[PDB]
Each structure stands twice: as C-alpha cells, then as structure tokens.
Design an enzyme around this catalytic site. Sequence first.
Site, short mmCIF file in Angstrom:
data_model
loop_
_atom_site.label_atom_id
_atom_site.label_comp_id
_atom_site.label_asym_id
_atom_site.label_seq_id
_atom_site.Cartn_x
_atom_site.Cartn_y
_atom_site.Cartn_z
N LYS A 240 14.76 -39.29 29.79
CA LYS A 240 13.51 -38.55 29.48
C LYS A 240 13.47 -37.25 30.29
CE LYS A 240 9.19 -40.61 29.58
NZ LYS A 240 7.80 -40.86 30.04
N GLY B 235 8.41 -33.81 26.56
CA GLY B 235 9.69 -33.14 26.55
C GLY B 235 10.59 -33.72 25.48
N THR B 236 11.77 -34.18 25.88
CA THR B 236 12.74 -34.71 24.94
C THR B 236 13.38 -35.96 25.53
OG1 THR B 236 14.82 -33.72 25.62
CG2 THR B 236 13.23 -32.26 24.60
N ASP C 277 6.00 -47.76 29.77
CA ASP C 277 4.98 -46.72 29.89
C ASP C 277 4.02 -46.96 31.05
OD1 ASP C 277 3.01 -44.65 29.37
OD2 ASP C 277 3.72 -44.61 27.29
N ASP D 132 -2.65 -49.31 29.90
CA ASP D 132 -2.30 -48.77 28.59
C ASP D 132 -1.44 -49.76 27.81
OD1 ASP D 132 -2.44 -46.92 26.52
OD2 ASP D 132 -0.79 -45.69 27.25
N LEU E 220 16.46 -38.63 20.76
CA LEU E 220 15.66 -39.66 20.14
C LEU E 220 14.27 -39.18 19.74
CD1 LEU E 220 16.46 -42.84 22.33
CD2 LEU E 220 17.54 -42.05 20.20
N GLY E 221 13.77 -38.13 20.36
CA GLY E 221 12.43 -37.68 20.06
C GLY E 221 12.03 -36.54 20.97
N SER E 222 11.01 -35.80 20.53
CA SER E 222 10.50 -34.68 21.28
C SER E 222 8.98 -34.68 21.20
CB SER E 222 11.06 -33.35 20.76
OG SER E 222 10.45 -32.26 21.43
N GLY E 223 8.36 -33.78 21.96
CA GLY E 223 6.91 -33.69 21.96
C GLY E 223 6.35 -33.01 23.18
N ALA E 224 5.18 -33.47 23.63
CA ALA E 224 4.52 -32.85 24.77
C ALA E 224 5.32 -33.06 26.05
CB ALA E 224 3.10 -33.41 24.93
N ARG F 53 2.69 -50.13 20.94
CA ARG F 53 3.53 -48.93 21.02
C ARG F 53 4.22 -48.83 22.36
NH1 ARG F 53 -1.73 -47.33 21.32
NH2 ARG F 53 -2.31 -46.74 23.46
N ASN F 54 3.72 -49.53 23.38
CA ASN F 54 4.28 -49.49 24.72
C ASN F 54 5.09 -50.72 25.07
OD1 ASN F 54 3.32 -46.95 25.30
ND2 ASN F 54 1.34 -47.68 26.00
C1 LIG Z 1 7.71 -42.85 21.25
C2 LIG Z 1 8.23 -44.27 21.40
C3 LIG Z 1 9.75 -44.41 21.45
O1 LIG Z 1 10.34 -43.92 22.31
N1 LIG Z 1 10.49 -45.13 20.46
C4 LIG Z 1 11.92 -45.27 20.52
C5 LIG Z 1 12.58 -45.03 19.37
C6 LIG Z 1 13.93 -45.16 19.35
C7 LIG Z 1 14.64 -45.55 20.45
O2 LIG Z 1 15.98 -45.62 20.18
C8 LIG Z 1 16.82 -46.36 20.92
C9 LIG Z 1 13.97 -45.80 21.63
N2 LIG Z 1 14.65 -46.21 22.81
C10 LIG Z 1 14.15 -46.04 24.15
C11 LIG Z 1 13.20 -45.11 24.50
C12 LIG Z 1 12.74 -44.98 25.83
C13 LIG Z 1 11.67 -43.92 26.15
N3 LIG Z 1 10.91 -43.46 25.23
C14 LIG Z 1 10.07 -42.57 25.68
S1 LIG Z 1 8.83 -41.66 24.74
C15 LIG Z 1 7.86 -40.72 25.92
N4 LIG Z 1 10.32 -42.44 26.95
C16 LIG Z 1 11.28 -43.24 27.27
C17 LIG Z 1 11.76 -43.27 28.70
C18 LIG Z 1 10.92 -43.59 29.72
C19 LIG Z 1 11.39 -43.58 31.00
C20 LIG Z 1 12.69 -43.22 31.25
F1 LIG Z 1 13.16 -43.21 32.47
C21 LIG Z 1 13.53 -42.87 30.25
C22 LIG Z 1 13.04 -42.90 28.98
C23 LIG Z 1 13.31 -45.82 26.74
C24 LIG Z 1 14.26 -46.71 26.31
N5 LIG Z 1 14.66 -46.77 25.07
C25 LIG Z 1 12.61 -45.68 21.64
#
Ligand SMILES: CCC(=O)Nc1ccc(OC)c(Nc2cc(-c3[nH]c(SC)nc3-c3ccc(F)cc3)ccn2)c1
Length: 286
Positions: A50, A29-30, A155, A137, A23-27, A141-142
């Site tokens: 995460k 991790g993934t 978050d 925070d 779903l995404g990467s960065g500082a 976005r959170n």
């Molecule tokens: C950067 C913002 C972002 O994530 N948008 C986004 C875009 C598309 C998506 O598709 C389904 C989702 N779903 C989504 C994302 C997270 C998420 N995310 C991020 S980012 C640092 N950590 C987590 C996270 C946090 C704690 C965990 F134990 C496991 C995962 C949790 C649940 N669901 C999220």
Amino acid sequence: GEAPNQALLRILKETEFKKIKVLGSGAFGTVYKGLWIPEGEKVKIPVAIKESPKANKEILDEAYVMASVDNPHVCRLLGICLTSTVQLITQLMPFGCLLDYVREHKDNIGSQYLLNWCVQIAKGMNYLEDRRLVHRDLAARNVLVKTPQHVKITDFGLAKLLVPIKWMALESILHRIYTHQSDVWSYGVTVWELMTFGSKPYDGIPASEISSILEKGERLPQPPICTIDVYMIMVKCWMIDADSRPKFRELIIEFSKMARDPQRYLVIQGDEDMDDVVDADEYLIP
Ligand SMILES: CCC(=O)Nc1ccc(OC)c(Nc2cc(-c3[nH]c(SC)nc3-c3ccc(F)cc3)ccn2)c1
C-alpha cells in the site's frame, strides 16, 4: 499499569520486493500486489504493498496497530519501507475482501462456509478484545480472504486502545462511545451482510435517519436463508443495553455449535516459476 508494547517494526529495502500488478487506486494511494524476497533468505513471499501530507501520520498509526497483532484471523504487517513514499507491506490476500467475494459467488456458497466465516471473524475480534483493541470499523468490506476457508480482519486505521453510520452501535452514533460491545453491534451487521450474500444494510435510508429508526426499535430484517436461531443471535448484537449483547467469546461458541450441523441453521437452495514461494503465515521471524 499498561504492559510495554514490544512489537518489532521491520524496515524493508525497496530492492527486496518486486511489484507485479496494481490492485486498486484512490484517495489513500495505490495498492500493489508483488513478491517480497528477504535479503539472503531463499524465499519469495506474496505481498500487498500500500503506497504526501499528514496522511503520513495515519498510515503510521495503521502500521503501529498491524505490527502489534499476531493471530490467525487478523492481518499483520510484514514491514514498512521509507522511500520517498511510505509503503506498508502485508500478506497478500488473493481472493479480495469478503463482501465482494460473497457477491461474486452467491450461487456457490454453502452453509458450512458462511458459519465458518462467522466463527473466524469472532475469533479475530475476541483476540483484539484480549489486546484491549477496539476496531471501530468492522464490516464485511474489511474482512480479507486468504483462501475461501480462511479469512482475516483488516483495516486498523480507526482502531484505538480502549463515519460508517449503518454499522455503528446506537451509543456511538449518539455519544461517540466505542467499546468492545459496540464492536459486537458491527459484528451483527457484518453477519447480516454475509447471510444476505452482500446486500446493503438499510438500503435507501439516509444515514441521518438511522438514529431515529434505531431508537424507535427497528432493526435489519431476517435474511431469507436464516433460521430464527441465527437471526436471534444477530438481534441480540443489536440490543440498546450494550452489556446485554453477546461477548465475542460466546459468539465463537454459538456459531461453532451451528457449524457442526450447518443445514439445521441455514436453509440454502442447492446448499509460473514459484519454486521457493512461501505464504507469509509460514514465514516466521524470531
Ligand atoms: C478495497 C478493498 C480491497 O483491497 N480488495 C482487494 C481486491 C483484490 C485483492 O487482490 C489480491 C486484494 N488483496 C489484498 C489487499 C490488501 C489491501 N487493500 C487495501 S485497500 C486501502 N489495502 C491493503 C493493504 C493494507 C495494509 C498493507 F500493509 C498493505 C496493503 C491487503 C492484502 N491483500 C484486495
């Protein structure tokens, strides 16, 4: 005189869950999306996963907080996995974060949804206050979107048991003081983000200027869709005296009343084989 934190930290085996897509990467991790299948339980649960140095220790602080919360409008931990990398596992929120959601759907978001989101975020924040947790925070976005009808605060890396400058109360910018009432200030900014369909607060103003501007009395402007009834609630969240701001429990009441007649308060133009899949909200452990 504090109560014992009897939350349960579940340790999951890497073989119990299948990563499907990144779903995404960065500082950090993934972040993956996948399916978690508990040992011998006949369920598949959609999850976000995460995935090297002391960064080890704030991921665990975040796990500690997410394991200690249980409320329909807060994201909670399902477990952690202690492989070569530390992985946090939580309920998948398939519609992403609310900030991107309102940006991508500006033309299809009516007043009923906006005000319902405001009620739900206040419910989640009031629960955190019940648990004596300061988020520090809060921002659009959170906030994650389970369905368009159901959002949850996330978050908890910065949460404490009692910098993003443009969301911070004045007393936190000046003296690094954070209370539940400084959380209320950030709630006001988050509502402003929603009502402007995802605009950036104090767009173009350097963060070093925010304290002076706020001290001279300036605040974010009235969004075009907001009646004075809604904007006055936001302004109240931005009082200098922290104890004259609303309580989250009062913000629940006020937005709930407006949610019963949404167009009086917001003026908006035109306003797979998944046989044993179960959402995490229906997977309850003793
Ligand atoms: C950067 C913002 C972002 O994530 N948008 C986004 C875009 C598309 C998506 O598709 C389904 C989702 N779903 C989504 C994302 C997270 C998420 N995310 C991020 S980012 C640092 N950590 C987590 C996270 C946090 C704690 C965990 F134990 C496991 C995962 C949790 C649940 N669901 C999220």
